[PDB]
Amino acid sequence: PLESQYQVGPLLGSGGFGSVYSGIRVSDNLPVAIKHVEKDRISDWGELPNGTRVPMEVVLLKKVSSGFSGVIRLLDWFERPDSFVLILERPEPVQDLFDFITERGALQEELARSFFWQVLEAVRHCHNCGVLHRDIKDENILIDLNRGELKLIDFGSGALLKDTVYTDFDGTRVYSPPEWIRYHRYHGRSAAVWSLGILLYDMVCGDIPFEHDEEIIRGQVFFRQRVSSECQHLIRWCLALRPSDRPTFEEIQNHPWMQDVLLPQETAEIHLHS
DSSP: OHHHHEEEEEEEEESSSOEEEEEEETTTTEEEEEEEEEGGGOOOEEEOSSOOEEEHHHHHHHHHOSSOSSBOOEEEEEEOSSEEEEEEEOOSSEEEHHHHHHHHOSOOHHHHHHHHHHHHHHHHHHHHHTEEOSOOSGGGEEEETTTTEEEEOOOTTOEEOOSSOBOOOOSOGGGSOHHHHHHSOBOHHHHHHHHHHHHHHHHHHSSOSOOSHHHHHHOOOOOSSOOOHHHHHHHHHHTOSSGGGSOOHHHHHTSGGGOSOOOHHHHIIIIIOO
16 A cells, blocks of 8 residues: 555655655654656666566666665555656765765865765676666765765666667766767676766866767866876776776776775765764
């Protein structure tokens, strides 16, 4: 019984995902987030383990839901006449990385190192669970401000991870690789690495490097803010024009700029607690 179990709260957002409301699970007064997805608007569908058909978004969330805190977790879900409703964790207090970056501008490297590190573990998690996010960016990342933990959200453009070429893509253009732009083809891992690179530039310069199609393909990176040489290196590396030339996840995490990561809590005390 959907509307017995939860107590609708304020619309928290509307965008390329749909309509998200704050909610309380009356059953234990747990802070949750209720999201509505219209059937008419879902272009990608998938089969539950049971195999019955849901929106891919749900398939992907089930697959990563256990047991990490790196990724937002799907509690439950329901079907309606024209919509599916998803019940997902709600951290509080929370802010998303974009809003965070807009308020506080470009970030200290020690902080960007922490976040960026945590994003890496959350993308590894998804890859490990057989899931490709396809829309990694500041908007799709929440900062739990007390714990200093980051959570990856919004699997609405995602896909089951595979080793072959993808030829569809409905994520955020500006974070998409040159080879998508030029050839409508890409591979999951390599494209994720690219997006991970735009994100890093974003963290450390307070804004994305490439705005237009031509600059993405040109692939040449200008820094508008004092950035460490080691960090500029990992960035230019992540954004190698040729996919095979890009760093794997291991290599990013074994990079000299990635060393000495703060722990999440530590990061909150040092940077998030005012």
